[PDB]
Design a protein. Structure first.
Ligand SMILES: [Mg+2]
Length: 364
């Protein structure tokens, strides 16, 4: 009874369901001990932007190797979650461990009011490589939206809103990306790889190395708050909710409540407006020997309405080029009427749901 009743309850509440990634979506985590040193010093160039950072310790592996994780919350998070929770029932779905997810939830949602126990992790999701809507909503995905910095982990599902990856701890990636894409290995091997990765990050102190280099040459401060993604994301999520409920009112009323709206149809229609009419040819972006049309970049671009072509037989509108020294660049220039731009034109445009001026992304 539970699944079909939740759908009915959510419609009575006039809400949708939101699946929320943690790492590089709403937080950025590191184990570099440099952060604790900078936090301990009000005179440090980085201290002010670290004031909101929170930490916790976890014991990991069979030897109980212990690490202090430092968590930066993306700017505007508390307000974003409060406002979005009025419109969406929130879930966490992370590739981090259950213990990691619980520690993060204890800081972002101490009393449980935002997520309750709707926290899915590597321990219980069923895969260490891919995420699936069907783990939460096996029979009806029509009301669920995902926010995640990665499209590949969702196979570029139509219900995904890919977000700009949050990189506050400069040079630190995703501390929970160890097993993405891979086969399952023995726990023994997974634990060995995890501890190795964590030990490396602690021992190499990448934040210190980068900050030292800057000082040896805000401009000289490594860490900055310059991220406004949640403000943008809130607007997108509010629009999806409103379109859904307007369509739901229309469809259900005309069908005697037998048919309903579907965010998996709504979202592609919104995205397809962004690069509608663009026909993209890549040069030097996808590795030689790799299938272009199934690549992440091509799938991301096509989700926003771009066509992708592989040659000049029907001239593209844009040549997306990595290097100026290629025959594809020379040909596009010699042919005329084709915009030759850096990859950043595409990724920044897709990131902003807005086609940016090509003149800002010329190659040199
Ligand atoms: Mg992530």
């Amino acid at each position: 009874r539970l699944e079909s009743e939740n759908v009915k309850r959510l419609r009575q509440e006039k809400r949708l369901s939101l699946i929320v990634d943690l790492d590089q979506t709403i937080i950025h985590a590191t184990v570099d001990p440099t952060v604790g040193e900078w936090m301990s010093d009000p005179g440090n160039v980085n201290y002010d932007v670290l004031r909101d950072v929170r930490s916790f310790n976890l014991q990991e592996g069979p030897s109980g190797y212990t690490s202090c994780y430092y968590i930066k919350f993306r700017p505007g998070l508390a307000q974003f979650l409060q406002k979005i929770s009025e419109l969406y029932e929130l879930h966490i779905y992370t590739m981090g461990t259950k213990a990691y997810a619980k520690e993060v939830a204890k800081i972002i949602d101490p009393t449980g009011k935002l997520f309750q126990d709707r926290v899915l992790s590597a321990d219980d999701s069923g895969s260490l490589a891919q995420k699936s809507l069907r783990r939460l909503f096996p029979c009806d995905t029509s009301m669920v939206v995902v926010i995640d910095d990665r499209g590949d982990v969702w196979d570029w599902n139509p219900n995904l809103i890919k977000v700009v990856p949050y990189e506050f701890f400069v040079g630190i990636g995703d501390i929970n990306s160890n097993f993405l894409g891979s086969n399952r290995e023995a726990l023994e091997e997974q634990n060995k790889e995890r501890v190795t990765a964590l030990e490396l990050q602690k021992s190499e102190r990448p934040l210190a190395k980068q900050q030292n280099a800057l000082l040896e040459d805000p401009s000289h401060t490594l860490l900055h708050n310059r991220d406004h993604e949640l403000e943008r994301l809130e607007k997108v999520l509010k629009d999806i909710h409103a379109v859904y409920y307007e369509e739901e009112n229309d469809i259900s009323s005309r069908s005697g409540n037998h048919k309903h709206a579907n965010v998996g149809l709504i979202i592609p229609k919104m995205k397809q407006k962004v690069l509608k009419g663009c026909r993209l040819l890549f040069s030097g972006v996808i590795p030689l020997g790799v299938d272009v049309l199934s690549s992440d970049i091509a799938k991301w671009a096509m989700s926003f309405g771009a066509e992708v072509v592989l040659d000049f037989s029907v001239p593209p509108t844009h040549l997306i080029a990595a290097k100026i020294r290629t025959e594809k660049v020379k040909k596009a220039v010699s042919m005329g009427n084709i915009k030759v731009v850096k990859l950043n034109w595409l990724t920044e445009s897709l990131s902003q749901w807005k086609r940016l001026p090509e003149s800002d992304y010329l190659l040199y």
